[PDB]
RNA sequence: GCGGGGUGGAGCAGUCAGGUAGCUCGUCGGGCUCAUAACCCGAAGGUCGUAGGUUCAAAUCCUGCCCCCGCAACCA
RNA sequence: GACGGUAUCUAACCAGAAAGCCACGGCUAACUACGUGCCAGCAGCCGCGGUAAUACGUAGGUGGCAAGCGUUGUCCGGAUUUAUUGGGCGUAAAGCGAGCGCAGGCGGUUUCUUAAGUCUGAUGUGAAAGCCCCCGGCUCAACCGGGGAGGGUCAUUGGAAACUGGGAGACUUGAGUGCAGAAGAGGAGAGUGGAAUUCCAUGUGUAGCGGUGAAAUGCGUAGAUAUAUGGAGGAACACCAGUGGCGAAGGCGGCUCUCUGGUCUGUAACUGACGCUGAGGCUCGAAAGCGUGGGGAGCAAACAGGAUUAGAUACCCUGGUAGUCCACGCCGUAAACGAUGAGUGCUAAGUGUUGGAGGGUUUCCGCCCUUCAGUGCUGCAGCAAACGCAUUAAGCACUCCGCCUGGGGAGUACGACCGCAAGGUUGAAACUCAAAGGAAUUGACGGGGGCCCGCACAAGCGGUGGAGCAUGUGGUUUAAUUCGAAGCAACGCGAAGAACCUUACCAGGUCUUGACAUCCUUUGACCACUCUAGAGAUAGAGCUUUCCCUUCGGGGACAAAGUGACAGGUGGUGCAUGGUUGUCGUCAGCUCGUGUCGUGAGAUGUUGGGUUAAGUCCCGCAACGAGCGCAACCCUUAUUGUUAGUUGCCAUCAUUUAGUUGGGCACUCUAGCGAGACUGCCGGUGACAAACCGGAGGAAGGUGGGGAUGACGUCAAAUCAUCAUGCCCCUUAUGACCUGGGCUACACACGUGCUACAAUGGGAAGUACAACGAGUCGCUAGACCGCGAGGUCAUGCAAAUCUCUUAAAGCUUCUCUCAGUUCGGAUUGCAGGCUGCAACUCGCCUGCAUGAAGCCGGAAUCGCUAGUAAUCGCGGAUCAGCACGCCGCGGUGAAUACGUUC
RNA sequence: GGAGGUAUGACAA
């Protein structure tokens, strides 16, 4: 059957909100500025392994923390690239933006990056079994307590869609204390959308 | 000309022996079934071919007339 | 010298004139694009084609072969698929139903002999050409020539002599005879016994009997059935009785006698291979059937009647003829079965039993051992596709016979033989299919079995189906009644808000780089507002008309224009998809790694014994572990310590109409941090286990109550209108703007609701008790106006402070008095109130008037196991306004569960 | 434990 979102289930139990601000009358305004901020960054930094955006609001300011496995690319030479990002965000948001780059250690354990990686390979006509197996290898070598991956759609151009997935170790989706990262990424192929889902189980909380 | 028949959609009673219009299957509506059949429950469908008489009252008795069916309509 | 100026040779000249055919899904060497969309076509077989075809057609490539390449036809091969080499017959095709036997095939030991078979030597011959072998010739090869070899079940002749055969002997083990015993439903004939059924007669006796799931037909007051005593007649033989016995098989069951077959065991006197098998022939051969003559109790095709049923030419019931029985003569077939031909020998064991034999003990009885022949069970080796067989082989061998060669057409046709007939025996082909089949495996299923669970049923309570109305759906209607959902799992569903908007539909009016983007662009503002026209969109006017900066060259931020790329689709396909969801179901399962078993698919684990809500745990186990689920971690609710004490609270105090003010946070409460339940404690049961039963303490006890949490998968289930997206389609349009209409249309059918049908009530008055929640142009106190909906001035509160919000059921009095009513409140008239630019189509509310059906609801059907159902209100999301819906909240608060057949 | 005997359901997918 259908399963609860692994992150939505643990938000407020062991996982915290990414939108780390409070508001009453500007809640609607702030929320949809965040969506424009998140959408803009996902376009500007599509080439950098940007995983988590945390937004904090202090009066007229907007503090934005960007987690990236390629901090050097995001920053650029002498902060050229991030500085061009604050100006673009300042124009977009209409207020002061501070951008904080955070280094993602162990990107092989970050579901979004792993899912994005598998998605890119499928777009290169890489064997879908191969793409998932080597993602599993990297995650386990990085020390994951377990990893689970799945690809759905018209695999290798098959007329009839099907889902093929692989797992290793433990992925206890019902254990609420388990720190299970999840991501869904889409790979657009010649035949249409392929859905890549990744579950990574790190040290339980 | 000799008989037989006209009553609900069809097939039949009731007609002799006057009082109250039904039975069989079917039709329609609802149930039951995944569905159909079977089954269950409700409803509808004729003032008795048609028009006069007799009577307190007729589908019934009397009379006519129109329809439908089997016979006959000529023998050495 | 016909060939003939032919071969051949030499010189010059030019790459110049000289390649195709088939195949490329697998077999099978060779792959991609278009085109086509179960069409056109391909195809040797399997099979391709249903709008993204390496299989159809074309092209480019590629493969094979090449002056050829392919197709068709024919033969051999592959084909062990007629098996001599070289197969089979328990269940796949295949053992004749069984015996007796002529011919034939085969046949024990041995001496001598022969030598037909067999083996061997020599000679003769097996023409030439041809294949093959050497050797030469043509420039090579083909081709030609020379020399050989090979080829015969050949003849003549000389040898050998084991084996088969012939001849003369000998032998005793096979086979038979004798002698001595053993058992038997073996057969035939003639008698005979009891039990029971039926009929008949006679008493007794009185209204039923009989029968089925339930009934009826039937029998009986003309005396039944039952009961007693008898008589008649037919058929079959209870107990004994037993994978017990006998027989070739079919078969044979009371007892007695007469005639008669066979088998088994000892003995070892006799014969001396006399044997085995056996086409063709002959004999026997269940049951049904046939003929002639008897018999006829019971049973029972047919048949009759009664039922069942949609129909029943059935199953069921009541009857009942042939037949079943006897004699004689036919028939000659059966899942005539061990679905396993006969004879012989050989190849572990264990244990029953029938008939014998021998010995060792036992007083006998019997026990012990050895053995023969049957009959069973279990089980090695071996065999087998497996199932299984296994000294009673399906094992290892030899002999003879029968039979088989894909399924269907066929055991049919024709012919023949046999038969009284019914039919039997023998037995094809055309044509057709690419399968039929055996065993085993995993699932699913069963009107199979066992064990369990769930408001599944049962036990209850209240409903739905009837009425009115609300709402969704079908249908119909319509210019449109937008699209989606359809068994559970569509139908108060997407819609948590259709008057306009929404809106996707329709009519009319309109626009064509566009309502919305990006990119180029240009002598920069654009909007905005104003007026006319217009339903409006829109036009035609007036009027204003932009910033950032750097050095002054400009650029960049934004329009707005221009123009071409492009935009735009709630257009299609949820059978191309991602995501999301329902569903089985919070049911307990679903698997993997390694090992092991199996030829194999698979199996094991995961089953078994317990236990649990649970694949929960324990124990056992050819398994040992692991993962996804279960459980736990999370939320809420029930008790409590501590910290905190306002806006919450008021016990001890004084005060106020007031928890008011002072004062205090003690209690309540709010909220963080903690405490508490863990089978932890105790008794019993249990396999020293898991666990179960009860107990104490405790606010809470065994998951405390509830929630969140939904395994691998299932239904090509839902969604291309949330979004996204492959492919397809539209592009002055299927895009876009506007006003109006529609989505709310109504002869009808269904789903879900609401309100009722009254007195456990209606009406009036008085009085009490919640919780979850919401609030800024919002929630609104208080006062005043209005019958009311509400209006007016005005107040507090961005809020455990103010407000919505004095909850309704409830309780206490009064009234009504069973009435379609003082029940019910549909429908309609009139008059108003709000929100809105506007409520005619289409809003909600109010007053007055009006006062419909409905008297508790057919078949059928739904929810619920307690703070639940039932009933009562309250808040919220969407929302200007608008729900009887949805989500949540508290009040009051039951009935029942024996039990698991359905 | 094992063994011989006593109503209906298009076609493709
Ligand atoms: K082909
Ligand atoms: K052979
Ligand atoms: K036989
Ligand atoms: K010889
Ligand atoms: K005898
Ligand atoms: K006879
Ligand atoms: K024996
Ligand atoms: K054939
Ligand atoms: K409906
Ligand atoms: K889907
Ligand atoms: K295994
Ligand atoms: K506390
Ligand atoms: K699409
Ligand atoms: K879409
Ligand atoms: K309703
Ligand atoms: K209703
Ligand atoms: K009262
Ligand atoms: K309106
Ligand atoms: K009702
Ligand atoms: K509202
Ligand atoms: Mg190939
Ligand atoms: Mg082709
Ligand atoms: Mg051959
Ligand atoms: Mg068979
Ligand atoms: Mg057979
Ligand atoms: Mg007979
Ligand atoms: Mg036969
Ligand atoms: Mg024996
Ligand atoms: Mg019940
Ligand atoms: Mg109703
Ligand atoms: Mg659909
Ligand atoms: Mg509209
Ligand atoms: Mg409109
Ligand atoms: Mg689907
Ligand atoms: Mg299982
Ligand atoms: Mg488990
Ligand atoms: Mg076990
Ligand atoms: Mg759980
Ligand atoms: Mg579908
Ligand atoms: Mg689309
Ligand atoms: Mg509607
Ligand atoms: Mg009444
Ligand atoms: Mg329950
Ligand atoms: Mg309640």
Number of helices: 6
Share of helix among residues? 25-40%
Structural class: alpha+beta
> Strand-and-helix sequence, N→C?
HHEEHHEHHEEEE
Q: How many β-strand stretches?
A: 7
Rg estimate, integer Å? 18 Å
Organism: Enterococcus faecalis (strain ATCC 700802 / V583)
InterPro entries: KH_dom, KH_dom-like_a/b, KH_dom_type_2, KH_sf_prok-type, Ribosomal_S3_C_sf, Ribosomal_uS3_bac-typ, Ribosomal_uS3_C, Ribosomal_uS3_CS
Family: Belongs to the universal ribosomal protein uS3 family.
GO molecular function, one term: rRNA binding
Describe the protein's architecture and organization.
- Helix 2 runs antiparallel to helix 4 and helix 5 packs antiparallel against helix 6 (128-141).
- With 205 residues, the chain is α+β, with helices and mostly antiparallel strands.
- The chain contains 6 helices and 7 strands.
- The strands form 2 sheets. Strands 5-4-7-6 form a 4-stranded antiparallel β-sheet. A 3-stranded mixed β-sheet has the order 1-2-3.
- The protein binds 3 RNA strands through strand 4, strand 5, strand 6 and strand 7.
């Amino acid at each position: 059957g259908q399963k609860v979102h692994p992150i939505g289930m643990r938000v407020g139990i062991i996982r915290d909100w990414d939108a780390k601000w409070y508001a009453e009358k500007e809640y609607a305004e702030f929320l949809h500025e965040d969506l424009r901020i998140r959408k803009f960054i996902a376009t500007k930094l599509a080439d950098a392994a940007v995983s988590t955006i945390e937004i904090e609001r202090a009066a007229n300011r907007v503090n934005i923390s960007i987690h990236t496995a390629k901090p050097g690319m995001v920053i650029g030479k002498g902060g050229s690239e991030v500085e061009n990002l604050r100006k673009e965000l300042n124009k977009l948001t209409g207020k002061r933006v501070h951008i904080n780059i955070v280094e993602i250690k162990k990107p092989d354990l970050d579901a979004k990056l792993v899912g994005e990686g598998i998605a890119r390979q499928l777009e290169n006509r890489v064997a879908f079994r191969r793409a998932q197996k080597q993602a599993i290898q990297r995650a386990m070598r990085a020390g994951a307590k377990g990893i689970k991956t799945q690809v759905s759609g018209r695999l290798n151009g098959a007329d009839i869609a099907r889902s093929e997935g692989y797992s290793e170790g433990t992925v206890p989706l019902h254990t609420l204390r388990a720190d299970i990262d999840y991501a869904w990424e889409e790979a657009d192929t010649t035949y249409g959308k392929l859905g890549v889902k990744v579950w990574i189980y790190r040290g339980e909380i």
